[PDB]
């Protein structure tokens, strides 16, 4: 579930 949280924090900008 670590790879899902990183992907969302980034492409958010």
Question: At residue 12, what are phi and psi to the nearest 5 degrees?
Answer: -65, -35
Q: How far apart are CA 8 and CA 6, in angstroms?
A: 6
DSSP-based three-state secondary structure for 11: coil
- Experimental technique behind these coordinates: NMR
List helix spans (H) across 1-13: 2-10
CA end-to-end span of the chain, whole Å?
A: 21
């Amino acid at each position: 579930e670590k790879h899902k949280i990183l992907l969302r924090l980034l492409l958010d900008s």
